[PDB]
Write an enzyme that holds these catalytic residues in place. Structure first.
Site, PDB file in Angstrom:
ATOM      1  N   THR A 157     -53.201  50.513 -14.464  1.00  0.00           N
ATOM      2  CA  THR A 157     -54.146  49.179 -14.065  1.00  0.00           C
ATOM      3  C   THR A 157     -55.104  49.032 -13.766  1.00  0.00           C
ATOM      4  O   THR A 157     -55.252  47.851 -13.292  1.00  0.00           O
ATOM      5  CB  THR A 157     -52.413  47.745 -13.251  1.00  0.00           C
ATOM      6  OG1 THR A 157     -52.608  48.531 -11.781  1.00  0.00           O
ATOM      7  CG2 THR A 157     -51.309  48.537 -14.082  1.00  0.00           C
TER       8      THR A 157
ATOM      9  N   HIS B 197     -46.821  51.550  -6.234  1.00  0.00           N
ATOM     10  CA  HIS B 197     -47.031  51.918  -7.058  1.00  0.00           C
ATOM     11  C   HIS B 197     -46.956  53.395  -6.471  1.00  0.00           C
ATOM     12  O   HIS B 197     -47.717  53.585  -6.222  1.00  0.00           O
ATOM     13  CB  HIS B 197     -48.245  51.579  -7.891  1.00  0.00           C
ATOM     14  CG  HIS B 197     -48.577  50.589  -8.751  1.00  0.00           C
ATOM     15  ND1 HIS B 197     -49.344  50.057  -9.024  1.00  0.00           N
ATOM     16  CD2 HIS B 197     -47.075  49.488  -9.263  1.00  0.00           C
ATOM     17  CE1 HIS B 197     -48.957  48.985 -10.074  1.00  0.00           C
ATOM     18  NE2 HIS B 197     -47.514  48.453  -9.588  1.00  0.00           N
TER      19      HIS B 197
ATOM     20  N   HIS C 278     -49.818  53.016  -3.336  1.00  0.00           N
ATOM     21  CA  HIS C 278     -50.988  51.946  -3.464  1.00  0.00           C
ATOM     22  C   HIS C 278     -49.758  50.796  -3.754  1.00  0.00           C
ATOM     23  O   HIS C 278     -48.873  50.724  -4.155  1.00  0.00           O
ATOM     24  CB  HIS C 278     -52.259  51.966  -3.795  1.00  0.00           C
ATOM     25  CG  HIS C 278     -51.339  52.072  -5.505  1.00  0.00           C
ATOM     26  ND1 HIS C 278     -51.644  52.647  -5.910  1.00  0.00           N
ATOM     27  CD2 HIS C 278     -51.848  50.798  -6.393  1.00  0.00           C
ATOM     28  CE1 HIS C 278     -51.724  52.493  -7.845  1.00  0.00           C
ATOM     29  NE2 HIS C 278     -51.376  51.249  -7.413  1.00  0.00           N
TER      30      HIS C 278
ATOM     31  N   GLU D 166     -48.386  42.464 -10.859  1.00  0.00           N
ATOM     32  CA  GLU D 166     -48.834  43.533 -11.912  1.00  0.00           C
ATOM     33  C   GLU D 166     -47.738  42.889 -13.154  1.00  0.00           C
ATOM     34  O   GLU D 166     -48.353  42.044 -14.050  1.00  0.00           O
ATOM     35  CB  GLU D 166     -49.167  44.428 -11.876  1.00  0.00           C
ATOM     36  CG  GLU D 166     -50.744  44.663 -10.541  1.00  0.00           C
ATOM     37  CD  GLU D 166     -51.387  45.544 -10.854  1.00  0.00           C
ATOM     38  OE1 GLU D 166     -51.148  46.993 -11.163  1.00  0.00           O
ATOM     39  OE2 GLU D 166     -52.944  45.659 -10.707  1.00  0.00           O
TER      40      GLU D 166
ATOM     41  N   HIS E 198     -60.617  48.964  -3.142  1.00  0.00           N
ATOM     42  CA  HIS E 198     -59.357  48.235  -3.917  1.00  0.00           C
ATOM     43  C   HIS E 198     -58.158  48.193  -3.617  1.00  0.00           C
ATOM     44  O   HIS E 198     -57.901  47.051  -4.302  1.00  0.00           O
ATOM     45  CB  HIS E 198     -59.941  47.958  -5.663  1.00  0.00           C
ATOM     46  CG  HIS E 198     -59.780  49.731  -6.095  1.00  0.00           C
ATOM     47  ND1 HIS E 198     -58.658  50.206  -6.534  1.00  0.00           N
ATOM     48  CD2 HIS E 198     -60.521  51.114  -6.527  1.00  0.00           C
ATOM     49  CE1 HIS E 198     -58.998  51.840  -6.999  1.00  0.00           C
ATOM     50  NE2 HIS E 198     -60.523  52.275  -6.354  1.00  0.00           N
TER      51      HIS E 198
ATOM     52  N   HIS F  39     -50.222  46.301  -4.863  1.00  0.00           N
ATOM     53  CA  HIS F  39     -51.088  44.915  -5.455  1.00  0.00           C
ATOM     54  C   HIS F  39     -50.602  44.095  -5.112  1.00  0.00           C
ATOM     55  O   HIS F  39     -49.601  43.710  -4.578  1.00  0.00           O
ATOM     56  CB  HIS F  39     -50.758  44.944  -6.659  1.00  0.00           C
ATOM     57  CG  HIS F  39     -51.260  46.401  -7.172  1.00  0.00           C
ATOM     58  ND1 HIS F  39     -53.122  46.647  -7.903  1.00  0.00           N
ATOM     59  CD2 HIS F  39     -51.202  47.365  -8.127  1.00  0.00           C
ATOM     60  CE1 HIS F  39     -53.141  47.590  -8.482  1.00  0.00           C
ATOM     61  NE2 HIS F  39     -52.206  48.498  -8.201  1.00  0.00           N
TER      62      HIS F  39
HETATM   63 BR   LIG Z   1     -51.337  51.465 -11.203  1.00  0.00          BR
HETATM   64 BR   LIG Z   2     -53.231  54.580  -9.778  1.00  0.00          BR
HETATM   65 ZN   LIG Z   3     -51.050  50.208  -8.937  1.00  0.00          ZN
END
Ligand SMILES: [Br-]
Ligand SMILES: [Br-]
Ligand SMILES: [Zn+2]
Ligand SMILES: [Br-]
Ligand SMILES: [Br-]
Ligand SMILES: [Br-]
Ligand SMILES: [Br-]
Ligand SMILES: [Br-]
Ligand SMILES: [Br-]
Ligand SMILES: [Br-]
Length: 258
Positions: free
Chosen positions: A196, A117, A92, A104, A62, A94
């Protein structure tokens, strides 16, 4: 777990297996900048990454996580809105299929191309798995990415992605300095929220920096060559791995800056 960001298992389905998805303190949120209150009681953030020890990068199906040695207080976050000390475990991102989406959190409904993040756990709970069971267990530093000039400190991450294309692949990733991912200003917004991704636990103090970092189009394009699938399986590009904004409910967003 079977959740994802595909056509049939994405964020709007998560509540079936994870009913907290409709909870009182879910993340991310839209940050209404007009409504967020300047809080003169908020302290400067203390980001102490001089001794950080990266170990490995993993495609978990993911996102990709850059993992750190969190067996001692090396890379820690303190100050800001926080009481005590939070140890860096992983970072990581997104990101989107296009530059017009991917973050996000949103800022007055603006979506950034990506969001970083940096996840930290409260040392008073001893381990990550205990921390996520507590309302003050985690502190996540969120940093927006916009597309423009390259981020030199990101390139080492970019260049290893070819080696972790598919779910379950990892690679050694030592000596990476996360200070190279920090914008100039540490001005921030903060609010109480959640992870999230499933299990969506309501354990996070969010600290979202106002100043985005700039990365190049070529850097983000390489994020979009990753795969959600495992080796040899039908290719599904790892894109649009973001949860949209959730209801703010009975929460206040506070600003560290006037
Ligand atoms: Br997160
Ligand atoms: Br996380
Ligand atoms: Zn994240
Ligand atoms: Br949703
Ligand atoms: Br603002
Ligand atoms: Br306040
Ligand atoms: Br967890
Ligand atoms: Br700014
Ligand atoms: Br920057
Ligand atoms: Br690549």
């Amino acid at each position: 777990h079977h959740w994802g960001y595909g056509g049939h298992n994405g964020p709007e389905h998560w509540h079936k297996d994870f009913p907290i998805a409709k909870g009182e303190r879910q993340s991310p949120v839209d940050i209404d900048t007009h409504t967020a209150k300047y809080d003169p009681s908020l302290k400067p953030l203390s980001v102490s990454y001089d001794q950080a020890t990266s170990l490995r990068i993993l495609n978990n199906g993911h996102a990709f996580n850059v993992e750190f040695d969190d067996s001692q207080d090396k890379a820690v976050l303190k100050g800001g809105p926080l009481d005590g000390t939070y140890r860096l475990i992983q970072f990581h991102f997104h990101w989107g299929s296009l530059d017009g989406q991917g973050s996000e959190h949103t800022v007055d409904k603006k979506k950034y191309a990506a969001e970083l993040h940096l996840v930290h756990w409260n040392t008073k709970y001893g381990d990550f798995g205990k921390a996520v069971q507590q309302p003050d267990g985690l502190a996540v530093l969120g940093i927006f990415l916009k597309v423009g000039s390259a981020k030199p400190g990101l390139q080492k991450v970019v260049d290893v992605l070819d080696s972790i294309k598919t779910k379950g692949k990892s690679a050694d990733f030592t000596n990476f300095d996360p200070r190279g991912l920090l914008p100039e200003s540490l001005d921030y917004w903060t609010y109480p929220g959640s992870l999230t991704t499933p299990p969506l636990l309501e354990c996070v103090t969010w600290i979202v920096l106002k100043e985005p970092i700039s990365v190049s189009s070529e850097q983000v394009l390489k994020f979009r060559k990753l795969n959600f699938n495992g080796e040899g399986e039908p290719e599904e590009l790892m894109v649009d791995n973001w949860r949209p904004a959730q209801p703010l409910k009975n929460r206040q967003i506070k600003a560290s800056f006037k």
